[PDB]
Fold Norbelladine 4'-O-methyltransferase.
Amino acid sequence: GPGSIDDYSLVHKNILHSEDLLKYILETSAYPREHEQLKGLREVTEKHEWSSALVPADEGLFLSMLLKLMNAKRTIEIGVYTGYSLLTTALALPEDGKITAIDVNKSYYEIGLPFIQKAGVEHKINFIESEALPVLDQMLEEMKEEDLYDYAFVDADKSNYANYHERLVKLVRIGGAILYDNTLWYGSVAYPEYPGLHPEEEVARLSFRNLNTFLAADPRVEISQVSIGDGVTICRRLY
Amino acid sequence: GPGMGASIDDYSLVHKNILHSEDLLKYILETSAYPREHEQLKGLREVTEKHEWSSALVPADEGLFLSMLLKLMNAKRTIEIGVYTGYSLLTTALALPEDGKITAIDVNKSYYEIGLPFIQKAGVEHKINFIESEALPVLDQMLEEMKEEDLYDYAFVDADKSNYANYHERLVKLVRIGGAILYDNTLWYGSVAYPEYPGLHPEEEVARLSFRNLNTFLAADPRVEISQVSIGDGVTICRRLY
Ligand SMILES: Nc1ncnc2c1ncn2[C@@H]1O[C@H](CSCC[C@H](N)C(=O)O)[C@@H](O)[C@H]1O
Ligand SMILES: Nc1ncnc2c1ncn2[C@@H]1O[C@H](CSCC[C@H](N)C(=O)O)[C@@H](O)[C@H]1O
Ligand SMILES: O=Cc1ccc(O)c(O)c1
Ligand SMILES: [Mg+2]
Ligand SMILES: [Mg+2]
């Protein structure tokens, strides 16, 4: 995966019933409200080999709306890539907000870093080039309740979401939000079997079918799976 | 529509969905919505599915989305415009704290009394002040009576589709700064995606033209930030800026 695209199958599949409907949403409601630096970051990223992993613009405004409605101040971003969702979070947070951004590939982050800097929000970002799980485990033993996160966006290795979940249910405050990206996996999760996939795509597809069942039965959180982008599952920590 | 006007016979969009397949929608509902649906919401939905205007019912996956927004923003005083049998109203009452208060407005209280037994069994009727009237006269009277200390945290708009713009001009002053106004059906079964659309009854066509104007207007409204979400039949969240 990101971190070749020639071998993947689902990258061009929609979950909406037509390209024209998605194009309407983006042109009517998303692009007119997209920050100029988000537009620049998106446009260079669409030329990249792994542009299919890019968080779409309509989902980005949805993430920003969640952040502002819940008055988020300290967040964690797992899976940065070129930094579209990271820049979305940094622009939504107040001037003194803080983000812990984790990704195994900092070179991806440096593609979007000039746009993050021009938006004047780089100071809010503490980027850590590493695999997410050791970072989350290190946090679990250093984290005190005063520094729990308000918000967590999970968008890294798809087969590792369940492992991320067991850490984040303790790293996010009570009432905070944990968001999992791609939980519908281009709609491929709607069937027990789905032919024609790359082996990595099938691993992710099975991982999401298991995760969606688990999150629906997890009493520690309340959930809401949203049919936006590639599917986003919002979980709110109950206790 | 359900409030007044044409029959359900003349509606042509009711069986469509904005997702690429009913199988994907069925998966979302069976995996993520129904296992989290309150027992009284399930009962309210099941009796509403047999009503003539079942197509106007807020789906279960969107219901949990509305409930999540209410809790993440810590809403306490909300206004519900367009009640029908009360699925979205019961979702709100269950999500709010026990001292939460809702102003619910609908032109037809008979619809509301269909779901009232489930609201009462849930034990949250004490949060609801139901007003049987057209929404706009109630909203206009509120603006003359509303203290700034009494501004609403959250508004759900789901009444006559052709009148959303008039509701908007009132609600941007009835909801607090940083509060949420939510407009339902802003995608109108995908029919808003084209300038012209064939074969719609006048009520459905006027609503389609109204949503196309509203979506363009809300995207240019400096009083709010917006987020159009492709859930249900499209929900546009607006957060008041000033
Ligand atoms: N084990 C791991 N730990 C941390 N990051 C990982 C990881 N495995 C993959 N990733 C990263 O997760 C990213 C997924 S693409 C994420 C897209 C991004 N959220 C956006 O807004 O567009 C890739 O950049 C990849 O480098
Ligand atoms: N002008 C008006 N003022 C107030 N309510 C109206 C109205 N015009 C129509 N309505 C009501 O708005 C409702 C739309 S159906 C709303 C569905 C409901 N929110 C749910 O959760 O399922 C109808 O019941 C109709 O009676
Ligand atoms: O009036 C018809 C209608 C159809 C679908 C809806 O979601 C709704 O609120 C109303
Ligand atoms: Mg993703
Ligand atoms: Mg509706």
Q: What stands out?
A: Helices of chain A lie at 19-30, 36-45, 57-69, 84-92, 106-118, 132-142, 161-171, 199-217. Chain A touches chain B through 48 residues (CB under 8 Å).
